[PDB]
Design a binder for this molecule. Structure first.
Ligand code: F43
Ligand code: F43
Ligand SMILES: C[C@@H](OP(=O)(O)O)[C@H](NC(=O)CCCCCCS)C(=O)O
Ligand SMILES: O=S(=O)(O)CCS
Ligand SMILES: O=S(=O)(O)CCS
Ligand SMILES: [Cl-]
Ligand SMILES: [Mg+2]
Ligand SMILES: [Mg+2]
Ligand SMILES: [Mg+2]
Ligand code: NA
Ligand code: NA
Ligand code: NA
Ligand code: NA
Ligand code: NA
Ligand code: NA
Ligand SMILES: [Zn+2]
Lengths: 442, 247, 548, 548, 55
């Protein structure tokens, strides 16, 4: 009712789920499945009990190659994981019937923890998840083995690392998808400081789901940042819809048409034709043998172009099965489309710009690294407001093993725990169902 | 597709390089083994190294995107990603840096192209790279005097020419033979000596460089006189400017 | 009549500057260079003394297959090899940064209210003079209250002191003139009048801590060190208890409530405290540069002295060492302050604007941007096309993009009198250049430039900012060479054309109008030349406490 | 027979150390001191030269109404006035911090797997040696790939280099020994075996960037500069394209994935990047100190060489300049490394423990804490009571608190072989001292000591940490003098008694076992003495690029 | 006095939506009220939220 747009929603097999959904049924501000994803990411922690046990037994605590000779403690943590986890749950929960979850994984080597929502309701931010979880497991381990007052500090160092001497939990054996609040590049950025590898890990390399999780996280951050307020709101919502939610099957259908033999350039030509076909753009002026296109709805052109961009990544990087070229695709999709049409590229040049530095900082000596270590909070890739990173996630999902810093190397603990959560693993399913469910409340 | 605005020969050349239906003029013949030698990634008759097991030996997520997107052959085999890099003289080489990347992502699949002022690069799966590289080296993407295959020490795009009309090369990988009027490659692209040099043919003459070039220059066709091309660039500036403020 | 860079091109090469051919490969490699020859011999000495190989000209590729060129420092007649302009080899450049890093501006307005309202004592020009004698003893590291204190050697910290300024001429005349930055002496009449009106009756300290401490420690040391000795001097000169509750009001005033840092602190990925280059906003850098008060009839000269200031600081020392390191970024920055090339292009655009609109008289809109930036861009790129020696001199595309766009963006601000349309002109210049030569800069050069047009006039959270408030931490600018120094120049441009006394902060402008500084901020390019010739004498050396 | 401090007290004073009365007021104030005399003279020259009053002995109160004492640098026979141990006046102290600030440890283990798995090339001792020749040209700031690069002067950057170490003796042996920190030469045989077991077949670089750059810039520069020149040297020595996708894996490995900073970054109120003093944990500072590998039969000497290293760095440079400034904190630190006073108290405690329990043989519990910390506290305080000259020497209560507690804490850890019980002993010492004399330190001295006992064994989020992991950013410790360096000593104490080769990080221990360092970390107090006497020659000076 | 709706914090990680949503709503409302031009609106942003994001 604020906006009149409607979209058709599909699943990751290209089948229609629900037709004519009001655009605002996909807003982070309204859709209950996006709320649940965000509240979930805030409150979920992965605990490495095996790592804690090995750190204690060797006295290797507090960061890379650190050890304290003479402090070794041999405790059978994994052997008593059930008892420890149940004792920890008692401290983590607020009441016996709440939404606290503690689940043992890998025969007791790992635990998925979701801290109760009630603690976040009276919290400024999200750090209660790691801090409440860490202290509950430190205390449960000490209580399990009657570790003395003199030695218990070693259990603390094995769980949370060098903190508070370091600002981060340096050498910790717990992990979260979010990172500490001090590392935000700006206020409102926390939902951007989630490594692309963690997103790909949680969604098990399913390309469209990874694109969906990444886009939900990016565009939701755009509301927290205030970027999706007032004049820009509709641009961001149409971006979420068409680029990350396969709205109208536009991404899916461009990949289908270009997947066997296509290139970035062929996707572009299909998209411009489709935007023409749908009335999004039209010929404004003729130069010499060159048509200049115009649009009366920049936000909708941007969204269609954004959908084309995602599909060109999937085609180009998918054909290589190698993620590195996503930086190139993000650049030349946008460069080429501007000279093809006379209209501005995605995010009015900001994708293209992000792609220039991202290319540099993934093929040079000065920094970044492979595509999987980047994220919306990274200084190299923060500039586009939600339209670049989701392409990176899709490219890393399609990588067949060309990276040294792959999700397997950076994100193994995140994958084992966070992929268990259905809404994290298959967000495109949950978000579409919720939007259908609230569709008449808009 | 229309590719690029403009009414000069330069603008038509830019559109031709992009258009995959435009048949690049072939200027020279190079053996497969000499392509492999110039790249320098492996020795002729050395098996392709792998970075991961072949795709059919791995168990992939059920993924409709994977199903719809056909892997290049090197991807199927698990080849390394390797590169070829060219430097183009500002004294009317036929291809130029942004023209290459724009054209590569219009013509070639599975391509990672990078554009810089003194170097332009494509990285892709090794066996596929060898096929693209044949076309980059045999057609009018390449002139042996005004273009150079250089994986490092790229200086020379902006330098004066030597007395033969050849672009500077710190490592002198391409040697002009006064006796034939032909250029040989004596080193691979990273600068290591080749057992046998590779014939790259004769440099294009002045009038053919002018007809084929994609750079605008006051002594060729100036960009400021391609008023339709300039008009679109000014239009993009204005519309980006206005969209970042409001919609 | 010649273009300004013609002498320089004739000095560097045997050919006429318009010739398209030359000779390579027979120059002797590094042996053509006096400087490289000194380095080869020094590398042998070093390696033999320490037992570890070091500089060796035969590692990697052989430099000097082309001419290793001398560079004219622009506005001077000094020609040097590029190595002499590397910040490591140039004491003038190191001292320029030390003079900024070790400076803090600290009000006396709250402090004087503590004295009168909380202690109930009087403040006059005489008490202030006594206070300033005391703090000029204490600031360098010497004691005023306790017994058995051990102190800094006064000759090691000779460059540390405290001065004051005020807009009230009659008050300024009653403070001992040894301690006063005299605004009417340092500034032309109309500028003085503006600056005194901004300051009014406020009294402000300019505090410089010792270079030797700044080099041992960091930028965030400055305001702490300042506050410590302000605090001791307030205790001594105004007869407090040495450590009572009211003492704390002075501490909070000096560190927090009336402090003006040169730079603000940075976020964690580039974690740094205050008074580091990344926190210095472009408007302050333009105000630190003192060209405005001396060259006020020549707005091109003022603007390009700011460019030289910022290209060296922001590209050579900040991006080229704090944020990276190694050989670094000397010629990415020297392109903007050598061979009179930026000068030729910017004088061209100034003359164009003056003749067509009158300085500051063009409409502040996109029509002016499109006109001026396009015209100047096309002028500068034509010079590279007409003079093959020029293109071989500024051999990297990034260098050319920064130079040509700086001219275009300064010229556009010259016409509108507004920095924001100048910045729009900078980005349009990049877009035209990229299409004209089918190349622009290094791999990551135009990240900011492709975001650029859209973010010029945005008002969103981390996008919208007047150019004067932007700096090295503006998100799109945080990483790359060949922009920040030029942006400081574009921020200066509209103010130079208007004849404004300052760009963004009038206290910062007055604070560097001080003849007791080591580096001369009125002639930045002159000082760079002096340091390149090994003629600059820096502060902070340890010769007095080390063996002869 | 004599306590160890008796010689110093006899050099300071005409009275025997037991006498309770003396003469004041007739020594001539500052005129009694050669050093103060030098300073008055220099103040007058400075002020005349610059036109601004500076050092003046008639400002504030008149120093030297009592004896201005000489200090013996403990373990030496050098006596100097305290001004000569001020970090500003002592090049050995400055160079100690530069040597730490400019050092980063960077693995080659991931890099070598990029080479073999991504690029498909081989790595051997030969390729490694070629790489190390390449990086020892590049690291000081010289070029390996591009034409027309300008470079640092090799003589200005002579202290910059790259060495490697590895626990694999056969690999170590193949690499050119110019580039190898030889673990078997530098460490006694049992220590060498431990360290080689920790490192195993990993191969680690110790990178030092130039002092001149560290002084111009900051600590956070070090790992960036190192990564740039490693990346260039990998490109050159292994023949990548100069800038392909795989280059990025070397960058990430060298800046993040296999990097050991000396310090971690700090929170905003004390905003600093990596490799600043506040980020260096106590266990690393103990391992930087190389007393452990030379004095390993004397655990007191090892521990108190660590105290000296930390007291100077953390109290004089860090808390006394970076976090405050001015005259600062020389003698809060000199109390822990002068006059052999800490040494007498700590050798007493070592002998107590040795005779009652056997080193490392006391139960690790509160009964041992109460016993040893109490006995050594009463011993130290009793020396102050029996020797008025000793109390007049360490005149500030804070100084005596830190010295007695350091002895009590160190001795408690000598008994238990555990740092955490050592720390409990430190706090108990403070409480007993406060009750005995009805005073302890300066106004804010025992913030951490009153929180102390309760936080020793806490496990809560920002409270609980083994002492070896704590440092200057542990919340209770973030502000105050007279604790951090003694804490580094207590961290060392149990490991020294146990005969452990390292306290917290074996890589850090080996990285400073390097005779190409400028500062000699094997004899910290000997070096402080040489700098006090103006006999130490630092790196980083600009004399070669300045006028004669 | 401004109280930003709870539903914005329900899908936010922390609390900065309050200042950021409030700032941009007032910036845009002021610009819209007086029809401030594209060229000058960045001044309204600086007046509301200051030197951010350079600081
Ligand atoms: C390895 C890289 C990729 C990487 O991330 N940085 C490099 C190399 C790096 C090194 C080169 C030092 C050495 O030679 O050992 C340094 C000095 C940075 C550092 N480590 O000290 C540098 N580049 Ni580069 N680099 C520059 C430039 C450039 C230009 C040079 C083009 C030309 O035709 O010569 C191109 C990018 C472009 O094409 O636009 C270039 C590329 C490259 N840049 C290619 C190597 C190119 C080649 O193989 O020759 N630089 C410049 O255009 C000018 C300034 C110059 C920098 C030094 C200075 O400012 O004085 C230097 C800045
Ligand atoms: C103004 C303060 C309060 C403040 O926050 N810091 C002061 C002053 C400051 C100044 C004094 C320099 C000068 O004289 O101008 C410096 C050097 C810090 C700076 N700004 O450089 C210092 N204190 Ni204090 N301060 C010291 C000390 C102490 C002892 C001195 C006791 C005595 O009997 O002499 C007492 C605290 C206590 O009672 O325990 C103390 C007080 C004081 N300290 C009282 C003034 C005392 C007086 O009026 O005499 N210092 C010491 O205990 C030892 C080290 C010594 C520091 C210099 C160095 O370490 O060499 C100095 C450290
Ligand atoms: C990107 C980031 O690097 P990381 O990805 O964080 O390793 C950043 N470096 C840079 O921005 C380097 C900037 C200057 C050198 C590049 C030349 S244009 C840093 O060190 O904070
Ligand atoms: O080659 S790159 O553009 O990555 C480096 C510029 S110095
Ligand atoms: O007097 S105070 O204890 O505040 C200062 C100690 S130097
Ligand atoms: Cl809209
Ligand atoms: Mg053939
Ligand atoms: Mg006697
Ligand atoms: Mg007696
Ligand atoms: Na000449
Ligand atoms: Na060389
Ligand atoms: Na005596
Ligand atoms: Na005095
Ligand atoms: Na602070
Ligand atoms: Na000299
Ligand atoms: Zn410094």
């Amino acid at each position: 009712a604020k906006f009149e747009d409607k979209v058709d929603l599909y699943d990751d097999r290209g089948n229609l789920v629900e037709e004519q959904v009001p655009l605002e049924a996909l807003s982070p501000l309204r859709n209950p499945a996006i709320k649940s994803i965000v509240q979930g990411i805030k409150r979920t922690v992965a605990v490495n009990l095996e790592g804690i046990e090995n750190a204690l037994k060797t006295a290797k605590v507090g960061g890379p190659a650190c050890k304290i000779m003479g402090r070794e403690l041999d405790l059978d943590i994994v052997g008593n994981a059930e008892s420890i986890a149940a004792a920890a749950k008692e401290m983590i929960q607020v009441t016996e019937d709440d939404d606290t979850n503690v689940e043992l994984l890998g025969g007791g080597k790992r635990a998925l923890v979701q801290v109760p929502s009630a603690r976040f309701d009276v919290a400024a931010e999200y750090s209660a998840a790691p801090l409440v979880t860490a202290t509950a497991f430190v205390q449960a381990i000490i209580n399990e083995f009657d570790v003395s007052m003199y030695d218990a500090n070693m259990v603390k160092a094995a769980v949370l690392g060098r903190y508070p001497q370091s600002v981060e939990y340096m050498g910790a054996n717990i992990a979260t998808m979010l990172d500490i609040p001090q590392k935000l590049e700006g206020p409102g950025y926390a939902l951007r400081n989630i490594m692309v590898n963690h997103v790909v890990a949680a969604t098990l390399k399913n390309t469209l789901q990874a694109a969906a999780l990444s886009t939900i996280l990016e565009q939701t951050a755009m509301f927290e940042m205030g970027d999706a307020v007032g004049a820009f709101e509709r641009m961001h919502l149409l971006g979420l819809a068409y680029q990350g939610m396969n709205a109208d099957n536009l991404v899916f259908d461009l990949v289908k048409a270009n997947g066997k033999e296509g290139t970035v350039g062929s996707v572009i030509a299909d998209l411009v034709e489709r935007a023409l076909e749908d009335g999004v753009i039209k010929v404004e002026k003729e130069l010499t043998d060159y048509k200049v296109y115009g649009t009366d709805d920049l936000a909708m052109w941007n969204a269609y172009a954004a959908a084309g961009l995602m599909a060109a990544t999937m085609v180009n990087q998918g054909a290589a099965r190698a993620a590195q070229g996503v930086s190139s695709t993000l650049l030349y999709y946008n460069d080429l489309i501007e000279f093809e049409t006379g209209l501005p590229s995605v995010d009015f040049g900001k994708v293209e710009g992000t792609a220039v530095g991202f290319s540099f900082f993934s093929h040079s000596i000065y920094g970044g690294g492979g595509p999987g270590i980047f994220n919306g909070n990274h200084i190299v890739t923060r500039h586009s407001k939600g339209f670049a990173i989701p392409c990176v996630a899709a490219a890393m999902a399609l990588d067949a093993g060309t990276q040294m810093f792959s999700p397997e190397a950076t994100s193994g603990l995140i994958k084992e725990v966070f992929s268990q959560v259905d809404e994290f693993r298959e967000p495109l399913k949950y978000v579409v169902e919720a939007a259908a469910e609230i569709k008449n409340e808009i | 597709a229309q590719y690029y605005p403009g009414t000069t020969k330069v603008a038509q050349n830019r559109r031709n390089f992009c258009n995959p239906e435009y048949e690049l003029e072939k200027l020279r013949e190079i053996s497969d083994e000499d392509v492999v030698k110039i790249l320098g990634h492996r020795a002729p008759g050395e098996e392709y190294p792998s970075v991961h097991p072949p795709l059919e030996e791995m168990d992939e997520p059920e993924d409709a995107i994977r199903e719809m997107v056909e892997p290049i052959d090197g991807a199927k085999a698990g080849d390394r990603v390797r590169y070829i890099q060219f430097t183009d003289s500002m004294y009317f080489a036929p291809a130029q840096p942004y023209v290459r990347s724009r054209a590569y992502l219009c013509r070639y699949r599975g391509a990672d192209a990078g554009t810089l002022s003194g170097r332009q690069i494509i990285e892709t799966r090794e066996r596929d790279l060898e096929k693209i590289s044949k076309e980059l080296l045999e057609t009018e993407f390449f002139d042996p005097a005004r273009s150079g295959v250089r994986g490092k020490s790229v200086h020379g795009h902006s330098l004066r020419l030597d007395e033969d009309g050849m672009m500077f090369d710190m490592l002198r990988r391409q040697i002009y033979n006064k006796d034939t009027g032909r250029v040989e490659m004596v080193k691979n692209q990273i600068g290591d000596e080749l057992d046998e040099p590779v014939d790259l043919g004769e440099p294009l003459d002045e009038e053919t460089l002018m007809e084929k070039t994609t750079i605008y220059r006051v002594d060729g066709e100036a960009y400021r006189d391609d008023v339709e091309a300039v008009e679109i660039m000014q239009r993009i500036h204005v519309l980006r400017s206005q969209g970042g403020f409001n919609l | 009549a010649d273009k300004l860079f013609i002498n320089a091109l004739k000095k560097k090469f045997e050919e006429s500057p318009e010739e398209k051919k030359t000779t390579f490969y027979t120059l002797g490699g590094w042996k053509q260079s006096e400087r490289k020859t000194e380095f080869v011999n020094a590398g042998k000495e070093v390696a033999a003394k320490r037992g570890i190989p070091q500089y060796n000209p035969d590692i990697g590729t052989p430099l000097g297959q082309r001419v290793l060129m001398p560079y004219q420092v622009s506005t001077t007649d000094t020609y040097v090899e590029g190595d002499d302009l590397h910040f490591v080899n140039n004491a003038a450049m190191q001292q320029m940064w030390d003079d900024i890093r070790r400076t803090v501006i600290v009000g006396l307005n709250h402090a004087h209210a503590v004295i009168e309202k909380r202690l109930g004592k009087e403040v006059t020009p005489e008490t202030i003079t006594h206070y300033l004698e005391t703090v000029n003893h204490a600031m360098p590291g010497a004691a005023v209250v306790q017994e058995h204190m051990v102190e800094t050697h006064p000759a090691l910290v000779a460059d540390s002191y405290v001065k004051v300024f005020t807009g009230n001429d009659e008050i300024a005349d009653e403070i001992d003139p040894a301690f006063v930055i005299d605004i009417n002496k340092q500034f032309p009449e109309d500028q003085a009048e503006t600056l005194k009106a901004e300051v009014g009756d406020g009294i402000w300290q300019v505090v410089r801590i010792p270079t030797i401490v700044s080099r041992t420690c960091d930028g965030a040391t400055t305001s702490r060190w300042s506050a410590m000795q302000i605090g001791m001097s307030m205790i001594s000169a105004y007869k407090q208890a040495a450590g009572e509750a009211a003492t704390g009001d002075f501490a909070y005033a000096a560190k927090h409530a009336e402090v003006i840092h040169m730079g603000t602190y940075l976020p964690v990925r580039r974690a740094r405290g205050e008074n580091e280059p990344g926190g210095v906003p472009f408007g302050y850098l333009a105000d630190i540069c003192q060209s405005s008060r001396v060259n006020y009839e020549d707005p091109v000269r003022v603007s390009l002295d700011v460019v030289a200031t910022g290209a060296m600081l922001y590209d050579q020392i900040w991006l080229g060492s704090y944020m990276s390191g190694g050989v670094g970024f000397t010629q990415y920055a020297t392109a903007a302050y050598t061979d009179n090339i930026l000068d030729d292009f910017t004088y061209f655009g100034k003359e164009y604007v003056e003749d067509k609109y009158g300085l500051c008289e063009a409409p502040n809109n996109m029509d002016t941007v499109l006109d001026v930036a396009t015209e100047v861009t096309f002028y500068g790129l034509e010079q590279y096309e007409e003079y093959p020696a020029l293109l071989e001199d500024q051999f990297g595309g990034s260098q050319r993009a920064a130079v040509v766009a700086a001219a275009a963006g300064c010229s556009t601000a010259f016409a509108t009198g507004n920095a924001q349309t100048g910045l729009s002109g900078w980005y349009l210049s990049m877009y035209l250049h990229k299409e004209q030569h089918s190349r622009l800069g290094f791999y990551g050069y135009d990240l900011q430039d492709q975001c650029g047009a859209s973010n010029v006039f945005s008002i969103r959270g981390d996008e919208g900012l007047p150019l004067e408030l932007r700096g090295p931490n503006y998100p799109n600018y945080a990483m790359n060479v060949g922009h920040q120094g030029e942006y400081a120049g574009i921020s200066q441009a509209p103010h130079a054309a208007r004849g404004d006394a300052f760009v963004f902060n009038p206290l910062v402008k007055i604070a560097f109008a001080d003849d007791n500084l080591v580096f001369d901020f009125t002639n930045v390019r002159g000082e760079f030349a002096k340091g390149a010739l090994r003629e600059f004498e820096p502060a902070g050396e340890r010769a007095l406490i080390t063996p002869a």
